[PDB]
From a paper:
Two molecules of MrfB were present in the asymmetric unit. The dimeric status in the crystal likely arises from crystal packing as the exonuclease core eluted as a monomer on gel filtration. Density was observed for residues 34–111, 119–202 and 213–279. There was no density observed for dTMP, and only one Mg2+ (site A) was observed at the active site, coordinated by residues Asp107, Glu109 and Asp262. Furthermore, a predicted α-helix from residues 171–183 was in a random coil, which resulted in Asp172 being displaced away from the active site and unable to coordinate a Mg2+ ion in the B site. Because the mechanism for DnaQ exonucleases coordinates two metal ions, we expect that this structure represents an inactive state, and the AlphaFold model likely represents an active state. In the AlphaFold model, Phe171 is poised to base stack with the DNA, and in our structure is instead flipped into a hydrophobic pocket.
Mitomycin C (MMC) repair factor A (mrfA) and factor B (mrfB), encode a conserved helicase and exonuclease that repair DNA damage in the soil-dwelling bacterium Bacillus subtilis. MrfB is a member of the DnaQ superfamily of exonucleases with the DEDD motif, which includes the proofreading domains of many DNA polymerases, including Escherichia coli Pol I (polA) and the Pol III ϵ subunit (dnaQ). Using exonuclease assays we show that MrfB is a Mg2+-dependent 3′–5′ DNA exonuclease. The MrfAB pathway responds specifically to MMC insults and works independently of the UvrABC NER process.
Author numbering: 34 to 111, 119 to 202, 213 to 279
């Protein structure tokens, strides 16, 4: 039934089965010492502390939040989301998790896996246009109770009142990507994937999205340190 499952598993992608549907889930771990551009992910802890000690009212204030509450979130689209990526920073590590829609008609499985795990009220984002949340028809209570709470932009909107992520990476964060698959190619790659279901078509897209969510961490740190200096 589900094709290329062995090939997907080598890439760290496994299926999540739900209600006669499925989605594909990838998980990568990084050490807290990992440097992504100028900053190691361990500097997040410092900026969350400084925010909690700050009397400054700001859209990016982490006052009242712990570092684990923040979901660094980025999506790819085809117009609707087909890839949900997020990173989360814990005491020993950073976890990147990606939920891939294998084709239209699997949205219940996608939302069941994503909404089970992500606090959609605490997203850190860099999205210019409002999120194109996929449409879904379900009885399930977890999903229905969230559809109208699905935000246009993250709570921590890194683009607030304000430029491409690539340009910020190079000019501000000191991040250089090797042989990146650009976001504007994801639609065409995904369109061909729907038919052929060959993992090779999306491995580059999945790496790009992974690099996206890590850069959101580096950007949040960068912007916070500028503010709290
Ligand atoms: Mg992206």
């Amino acid at each position: 039934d589900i094709p290329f499952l062995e090939e997907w598993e080598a890439f760290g992608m496994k299926p999540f089965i739900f209600e006669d549907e499925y989605c594909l889930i990838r998980e990568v771990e990084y050490p807290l010492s990992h440097r992504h551009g100028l900053y190691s992910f361990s500097e997040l802890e410092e900026v969350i502390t400084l925010w909690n000690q700050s009397g400054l009212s700001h859209t990016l204030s982490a006052k009242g939040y712990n570092k684990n509450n923040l979901f660094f979130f980025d999506t790819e689209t085809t117009n609707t989301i087909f890839l949900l990526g997020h990173a989360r920073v814990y005491e020993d590590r950073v976890t990147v998790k990606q939920h891939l829609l294998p084709k239209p008609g699997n949205e219940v499985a996608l939302y069941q896996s994503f909404l089970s795990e992500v606090d959609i009220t605490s997203l850190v984002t860099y999205n210019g246009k409002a999120f194109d949340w996929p449409q879904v028809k379900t009885r399930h209570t977890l999903i229905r109770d969230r559809l109208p709470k699905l935000p246009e932009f993250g709570h921590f909107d890194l683009l607030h009142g304000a430029v491409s992520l690539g340009t910020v990476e190079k000019e501000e964060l000191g991040i250089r990507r090797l042989e990146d698959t650009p976001g504007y190619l994801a639609p065409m790659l995904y369109f061909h994937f729907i038919k052929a279901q060959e993992p090779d078509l999306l491995k580059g897209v999945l790496h790009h999205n992974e690099m996206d969510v890590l850069s959101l961490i580096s950007l949040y740190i960068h912007m916070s340190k500028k503010i709290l200096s």
